[PDB]
Amino acid sequence: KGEWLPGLASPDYLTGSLAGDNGFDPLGLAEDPENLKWFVQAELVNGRWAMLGVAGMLLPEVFTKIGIINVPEWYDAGKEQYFASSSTLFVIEFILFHYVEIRRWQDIKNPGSVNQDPIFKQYSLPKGEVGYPGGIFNPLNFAPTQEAKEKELANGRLAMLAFLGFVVQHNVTGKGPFENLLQHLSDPWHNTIVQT
Amino acid sequence: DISGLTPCKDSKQFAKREKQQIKKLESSLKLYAPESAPALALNAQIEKTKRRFDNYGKYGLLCGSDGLPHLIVNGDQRHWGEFITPGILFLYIAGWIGWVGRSYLIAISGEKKPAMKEIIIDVPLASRIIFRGFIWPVAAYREFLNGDLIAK
Amino acid sequence: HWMPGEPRPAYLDGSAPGDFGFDPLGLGEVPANLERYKESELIHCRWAMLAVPGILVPEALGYGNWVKAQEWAALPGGQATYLGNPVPWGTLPTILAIEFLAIAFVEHQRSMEKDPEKKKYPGGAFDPLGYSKDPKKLEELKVKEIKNGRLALLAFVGFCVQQSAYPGTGPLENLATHLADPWHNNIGDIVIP
Amino acid sequence: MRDLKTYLSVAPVLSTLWFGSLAGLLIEINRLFPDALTFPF
Numbered sequence: 299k300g301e302w303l304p305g306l307a308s309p310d311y312l313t314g315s316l317a318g319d320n321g322f323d324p325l326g327l328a329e330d331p332e333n334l335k336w337f338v339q340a341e342l343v344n345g346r347w348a349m350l351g352v353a354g355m356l357l358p359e360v361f362t363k364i365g366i367i368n369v370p371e372w373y374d375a376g377k378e379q380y381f382a383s384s385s386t387l388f389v390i391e392f393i394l395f396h397y398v399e400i401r402r403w404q405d406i407k408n409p410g411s412v413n414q415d416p417i418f419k420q421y422s423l424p425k426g427e428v429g430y431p432g433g434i435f436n437p438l439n440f441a442p443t444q445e446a447k448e449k450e451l452a453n454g455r456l457a458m459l460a461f462l463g464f465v466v467q468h469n470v471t472g473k474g475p476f477e478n479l480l481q482h483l484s485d486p487w488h489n490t491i492v493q494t
Numbered sequence: 495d496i497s498g499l500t501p502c503k504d505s506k507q508f509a510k511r512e513k514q515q516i517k518k519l520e521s522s523l524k525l526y527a528p529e530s531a532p533a534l535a536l537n538a539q540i541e542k543t544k545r546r547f548d549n550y551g552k553y554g555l556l557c558g559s560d561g562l563p564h565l566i567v568n569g570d571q572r573h574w575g576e577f578i579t580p581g582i583l584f585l586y587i588a589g590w591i592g593w594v595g596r597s598y599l600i601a602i603s604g605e606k607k608p609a610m611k612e613i614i615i616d617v618p619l620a621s622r623i624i625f626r627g628f629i630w631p632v633a634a635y636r637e638f639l640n641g642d643l644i645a646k
Numbered sequence: 647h648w649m650p651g652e653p654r655p656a657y658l659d660g661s662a663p664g665d666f667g668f669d670p671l672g673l674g675e676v677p678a679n680l681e682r683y684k685e686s687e688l689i690h691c692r693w694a695m696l697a698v699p700g701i702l703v704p705e706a707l708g709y710g711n712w713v714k715a716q717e718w719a720a721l722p723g724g725q726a727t728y729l730g731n732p733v734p735w736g737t738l739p740t741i742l743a744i745e746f747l748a749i750a751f752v753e754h755q756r757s758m759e760k761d762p763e764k765k766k767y768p769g770g771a772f773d774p775l776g777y778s779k780d781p782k783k784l785e786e787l788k789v790k791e792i793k794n795g796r797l798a799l800l801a802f803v804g805f806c807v808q809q810s811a812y813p814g815t816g817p818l819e820n821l822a823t824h825l826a827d828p829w830h831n832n833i834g835d836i837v838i839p
Numbered sequence: 840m841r842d843l844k845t846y847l848s849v850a851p852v853l854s855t856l857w858f859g860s861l862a863g864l865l866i867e868i869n870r871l872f873p874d875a876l877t878f879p880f
């Protein structure tokens with residue numbers, strides 16, 4: 299579709315049949331079709347996780363302007379005491395995520411092989427694409443048209459860049475992502491990466 | 495105290511070495527007028543020596559009985575900056591260089607006279623290939639999985 | 647299948663009892679090697695399905711855990727005990743001699759067999775109640791035996807490993823410790839100190 | 840000149856330029872951060 303850089307030609311292997319195809323591959327990673335098949339799923343999962351991560355790192359700090367709750371910052375949330383030890387929670391998380399991610403992985407190898415429930419055999423996911431399971435994962439039956447997929451990919455890429463910015467700013471400034479915005483909005487020409 | 499060693503900051507022999515070096519540097523300065531350039535150079539040398547000794551004291555090195563720092567390479571987390579991190583950086587750089595060389599060699603293998611492209615380098619193609627080695631681990635690992643790394 | 651969506655090895659057709667295609671390393675490729683492995687698996691399962699009752703029952707009667715029963719033999723002059731009653735012949739060189747002779751005879755007797763089927767399910771006199779009379783029931787029984795044996799082997803591995811993390815403790819003691827405070831007395835602390 | 844550009848791509852001249860730039864970079868790096876025995880970061 300669109301060109302990431304006018305005046306340059308698109309790669310041959312990027313034919314525009316994929317969602318969010320702007321012909322961006324200067325370093326040629328996806329020349330091998332198997333690499334492309336793996337990297338599509340990698341991008342999807344990374345974007346979907348980063349969107350939730352950013353949403354959870356930003357909004358629980360926006361409370362200061364509205365003053366509903368009192369929650370520690372995203373980099374101090376770990377040290378707080380909880381009803382269970384950190385090791386127990388980590389063990390349970392590992393136990394569940396092992397099964398979940400092994401179930402997801404088998405679809406990439408042999409599509410359509412894990413669409414059936416293992417305990418209640420009368421239940422099965424409708425046939426779909428590799429990275430878009432559907433079924434009970436889509437309770438509202440929204441149509442997965444190409445426009446919605448492109449919107450999803452754009453939001454995922456933006457959120458990934460936002461998470462990288464959130465990580466890098468804290469190492470330098472030492473404050474929260476929202477506090478960095480208000481300081482910039484106070485004196486825009488004096489509060490940038492160039493401190494002076 | 496690994497292997498019976500002692501921290502540099504508590505070592506008396508380390509301080510004695512510093513004092514001897516500084517005293518040796520100071521005896522040469524008495525031969526020159528304070529305003530002269532050699533006096534300025536000797537002052538800079540003395541300041542640099544003091545700074546080097548202070549920095550070695552700060553980083554948590556270990557000294558022996560001779561007052562000289564020793565390196566621990568067994569993998570202990572308290573000394574990862576001595577061997578592990580520079581090793582990983584060197585491995586990354588060497589893999590970059592090797593991958594770029596292999597890519598350039600493969601690129602010109604299909605030409606009519608591949609030998610002439612080795613004594614007279616094709617600058618634009620190499621420049622285009624130079625940037626690609628920045629992600630060499632991913633490309634090498636995926637090539638290994640696909641079986642294209644080893645010649646048949 | 648041990649993992650749905652995974653191809654099976656060609657030599658694991660799904661007709662053997664307790665066959666689910668589990669062979670990631672391909673150790674059963676050689677037909678002569680795979681035939682031996684079934685006998686060894688059955689022997690291991692049958693030996694481990696007797697140990698599990700023999701580890702929990704003495705501990706459930708307050709006679710001490712399964713590693714305390716072996717402490718006395720390291721001492722000079724230690725004498726064996728059974729149900730709290732010392733046995734007259736419980737000296738170390740009397741026990742070692744009678745164990746080697748009794749076992750070396752039966753295992754060598756099993757070794758000399760040359761019919762592959764009788765090395766796994768010998769039948770005959772060792773089946774006094776005649777449960778093998780029905781070939782239809784027999785297949786279900788073999789599946790049940792194989793499914794229980796692997797569980798017993800896993801239980802014995804748990805027995806062995808739990809001892810290392812909690813020296814001097816019995817499995818029932820570990821269960822009692824876990825039951826009181828489940829959310830802090832578990833595996834997590836051992837893995838992450 | 841095409842021939843002049845060809846002579847600049849020969850192996851010895853290119854190697855000399857590359858190694859000169861490399862040595863300059865290393866000298867400046869060791870000038871800014873002298874006496875590095877450990878990676879402290």
Ligand SMILES: CC(/C=C/C=C(C)/C=C/[C@@]12O[C@]1(C)C[C@@H](O)CC2(C)C)=C\C=C\C=C(C)\C=C\C=C(C)\C=C\[C@@]12O[C@]1(C)C[C@@H](O)CC2(C)C
Pocket residue numbers: 322323324325326327344345347348349350351352354355371372373375376458459461462629
């Ligand atoms: C998933 C993700 C982050 C997820 C974060 C999560 C969940 C965070 C959770 C937490 O916060 C909460 C919620 C609770 C907080 O208290 C605590 C934690 C737990 C911390 C990031 C991905 C992040 C991914 C990123 C940044 C990727 C960047 C990649 C780029 C730029 C690639 C560029 C190229 O790829 C192309 C386009 C083509 C190549 O040819 C050319 C190049 C140039 C090479």
